[PDB]
Design a protein around this motif. Structure first.
Motif, PDB file in Angstrom:
ATOM      1  N   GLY A 195      -7.279  -4.658 -10.264  1.00 38.83           N
ATOM      2  CA  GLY A 195      -6.614  -4.148  -8.573  1.00 38.83           C
ATOM      3  C   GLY A 195      -6.044  -5.151  -8.153  1.00 38.83           C
ATOM      4  N   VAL A 196      -6.181  -7.099  -8.653  1.00 35.12           N
ATOM      5  CA  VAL A 196      -5.909  -7.904  -8.639  1.00 35.12           C
ATOM      6  C   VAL A 196      -4.546  -7.943  -9.214  1.00 35.12           C
ATOM      7  CG1 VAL A 196      -5.838 -11.018  -8.195  1.00 35.12           C
ATOM      8  CG2 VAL A 196      -7.488  -8.714  -7.997  1.00 35.12           C
ATOM      9  N   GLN A 197      -4.529  -8.053 -10.046  1.00 31.45           N
ATOM     10  CA  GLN A 197      -2.732  -8.624 -11.046  1.00 31.45           C
ATOM     11  C   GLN A 197      -1.786  -7.437 -11.468  1.00 31.45           C
ATOM     12  OE1 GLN A 197      -3.238 -12.110 -13.313  1.00 31.45           O
ATOM     13  NE2 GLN A 197      -5.238 -12.249 -13.375  1.00 31.45           N
ATOM     14  N   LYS A 198      -2.840  -5.933 -11.884  1.00 36.25           N
ATOM     15  CA  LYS A 198      -1.523  -5.333 -12.369  1.00 36.25           C
ATOM     16  C   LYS A 198      -1.993  -4.383 -11.275  1.00 36.25           C
ATOM     17  CE  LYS A 198      -1.995  -1.646 -16.136  1.00 36.25           C
ATOM     18  NZ  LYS A 198      -2.610  -0.423 -16.631  1.00 36.25           N
ATOM     19  N   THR A 199      -2.091  -3.492 -10.441  1.00 37.87           N
ATOM     20  CA  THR A 199      -1.475  -2.975 -10.439  1.00 37.87           C
ATOM     21  C   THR A 199      -1.765  -3.157  -8.518  1.00 37.87           C
ATOM     22  OG1 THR A 199      -4.173  -1.977  -9.288  1.00 37.87           O
ATOM     23  CG2 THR A 199      -2.880  -0.753 -10.629  1.00 37.87           C
ATOM     24  N   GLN A 200      -1.933  -4.388  -8.044  1.00 34.65           N
ATOM     25  CA  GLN A 200      -2.266  -5.032  -6.485  1.00 34.65           C
ATOM     26  C   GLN A 200      -2.661  -4.719  -5.764  1.00 34.65           C
ATOM     27  OE1 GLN A 200       1.288  -6.449  -6.284  1.00 34.65           O
ATOM     28  NE2 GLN A 200       1.113  -9.060  -7.966  1.00 34.65           N
ATOM     29  N   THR A 201      -3.674  -3.389  -5.626  1.00 36.52           N
ATOM     30  CA  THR A 201      -4.053  -2.953  -4.501  1.00 36.52           C
ATOM     31  C   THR A 201      -5.665  -3.036  -4.114  1.00 36.52           C
ATOM     32  OG1 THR A 201      -5.054  -1.854  -6.361  1.00 36.52           O
ATOM     33  CG2 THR A 201      -3.170  -0.813  -6.379  1.00 36.52           C
ATOM     34  N   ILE A 202      -5.730  -5.116  -4.518  1.00 33.98           N
ATOM     35  CA  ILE A 202      -6.479  -4.956  -3.999  1.00 33.98           C
ATOM     36  C   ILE A 202      -6.516  -6.307  -3.124  1.00 33.98           C
ATOM     37  CG2 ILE A 202      -8.753  -7.287  -4.278  1.00 33.98           C
ATOM     38  CD1 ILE A 202      -9.220  -5.669  -6.642  1.00 33.98           C
ATOM     39  N   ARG A 203      -6.548  -6.256  -1.664  1.00 29.35           N
ATOM     40  CA  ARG A 203      -5.849  -7.100  -0.777  1.00 29.35           C
ATOM     41  C   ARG A 203      -6.661  -7.319   0.697  1.00 29.35           C
ATOM     42  NH1 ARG A 203      -3.331  -2.924   0.031  1.00 29.35           N
ATOM     43  NH2 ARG A 203      -2.336  -1.946  -1.761  1.00 29.35           N
ATOM     44  N   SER A 204      -7.396  -7.427  -0.070  1.00 32.49           N
ATOM     45  CA  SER A 204      -9.474  -7.358   1.396  1.00 32.49           C
ATOM     46  C   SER A 204     -10.413  -6.501   0.658  1.00 32.49           C
ATOM     47  CB  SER A 204      -8.786  -6.531   2.615  1.00 32.49           C
ATOM     48  OG  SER A 204      -9.034  -4.916   2.412  1.00 32.49           O
TER      49      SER A 204
END
Length: 188
Positions: free
Chosen positions: A95-104
């Motif tokens: 989520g942080v590094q591959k899809t970048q879907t973790i923002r909050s």
């Protein structure tokens, strides 16, 4: 000798008393940490070679990723409290590094929901003082060795792994050298 201070490991000139036997630091923002977890499986290979009577500790750090960085340290405290590390480590890294879907913080929370932790259970943990003290421990452990970089591993609060001094031509050979070094330091 074959294992030399300053080569496969460094000695802390400031040893830390009562430290965990094997203490690993990481950040979900840390690119070598991602490799260590999903490609090299360092933690798991170290464990497979550690003697009996030795437990492994892994802590998250604040100094990467600013505000989200801290949220992740608190989320990792929740993960530790609930015993669900092995279920959230991969989706948090991706989520942080591959899809970048973790923002909050909410996106972090979703990862736990998708892994099957009930919302109520998560929010309860998130806000608990058990989790607050677990965040404190992570911070204190990192402060004790004045940690400025991750991934990092410390053995008995006295020795710090130094992977820059290990052939990385072959990932499997690197991992065993790393694991074998932890075993050596353990028996020291």
């Amino acid at each position: 000798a074959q294992y030399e201070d300053g080569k496969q490991y460094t000695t802390l000139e400031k040893p830390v008393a009562g430290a965990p036997q094997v203490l690993e630091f990481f950040s979900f923002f840390c690119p070598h940490c991602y490799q260590f977890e999903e490609v090299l499986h360092i933690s798991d290979n170290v464990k497979k070679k550690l003697p009996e009577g030795v437990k492994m500790t892994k802590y998250h750090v604040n100094f990467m990723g600013g505000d989200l960085g801290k949220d992740l340290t608190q989320a990792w405290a929740v993960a530790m409290a609930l015993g669900v590390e092995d279920k959230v480590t991969v989706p948090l890294f991706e989520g942080v590094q591959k899809t970048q879907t973790i923002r909050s913080a909410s996106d972090i929370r979703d990862v736990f929901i998708n892994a099957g932790i009930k919302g109520e259970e998560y929010d309860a943990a998130w806000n608990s003082f058990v989790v607050k003290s677990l965040v404190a421990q992570q911070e204190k452990a990192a402060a004790d060795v004045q940690l400025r970089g991750v991934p990092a591993m410390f053995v008995n609060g006295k020795y710090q792994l130094n992977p820059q001094g290990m052939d990385t031509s072959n990932m499997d050979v690197f991992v065993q050298q790393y694991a074998d070094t932890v075993k050596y330091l353990s028996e020291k």
